């Protein structure tokens, strides 16, 4: 199992969710965060005197997936979320020791396997 | 140490927090998130030492369950190091 | 890469952000959350991807900026990351 955390532009969210559902990746959660991506900074920011137009609203998606679905999930997000401009975001694939579905007590693979 | 990330229903949050406290699990953070239509959920993030992983997971499984689809999930993630900001040292 | 997750006091955020931009990280996100241990106390959660050579000094920069010496200062978690992709280019690493 892996926990996928993706940071994408708000204007790309709907395309991303549609692509994920199309890939059988249903269960997930999301929230708004402020972020700064790319490895760019304004001179004033690096000087520490300012931190204005450095942060922008992004959407953070958290998706638990079984091993077989890691590749399809990453590919769906990469295709849908890219604009080609700095600030597109990132995808972290995190190792997971255990997963539990609260309703059924199902664990690990069974807990993140597509309910359809 | 491990990092527990749990998604639960807002209506069950008080009960979950009460169970965690009864289990001696005190330090944690939480926030509202949108889950799965999208429905509001609460995401809890709890860093625990190894002996507290099980008690924490169980506290949440028992307090958060309603029996209806959408009760949530619990992830246990490996943590390489954890630092206590107050001391400037690992924990 | 490693994922640094820091929970800090809101009144220390400006200082921590300054330390992060001056340290140089390959991206960060942050948001307001509620801390506990009822009554919830505001905290700011920052998530920063940092590669191995620079994890220790980046953690030290955050520690120095965020510390007050009083209970409630927060914690910093360093998590392993299996893979990381840059969306702009699609590349892994």
Please render the helix and strand layout as text.
The structure is a homotrimer.
Chain A (H helix, E strand, L loop, with lengths): L1 E7 L4 H10 L6 E8 L6 H4 L9 E10 L4 H12 L8 E6 L2 E4 L7 H4 L4
Helix pairs in contact in A: 1-3
The second-level CATH architecture of chain A is 2-Layer Sandwich
> What would you call the quaternary organization?
homotrimer
State the domain count of chain A.
1
- Helix percentage of chain A: 25-40%
Per CATH, the class of chain A reads: Alpha Beta
Largest sheet of chain A: 4 strands, antiparallel
Strand fraction band of chain A? 25-35%
InterPro entries (chain B): N-reg_PII, N-reg_PII-like_a/b, N-reg_PII/ATP_PRibTrfase_C, N-reg_PII_CS
Family (chain B): Belongs to the P(II) protein family.
GO molecular function, one term (chain B): ATP binding
Pfam family, one (chain B): P-II
């Amino acid at each position: 199992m892996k926990l996928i955390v993706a940071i994408v532009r708000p204007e790309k969210l709907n395309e991303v969710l549609k692509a994920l559902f199309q890939a059988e990746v249903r269960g997930l959660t999301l929230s708004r965060v402020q972020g700064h991506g790319g490895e760019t900074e304004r001179v004033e920011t690096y000087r520490g005197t300012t931190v204005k137009m450095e942060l922008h609203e992004k959407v953070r998606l958290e998706i638990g997936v079984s091993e077989p679905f890691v590749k399809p999930t990453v590919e769906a997000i990469l295709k849908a979320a890219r604009t080609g401009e700095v600030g597109d975001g990132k995808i972290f694939v995190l190792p997971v020791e255990k997963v539990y579905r609260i309703r059924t007590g199902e664990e690990d693979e069974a807990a993140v396997t597509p309910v359809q």
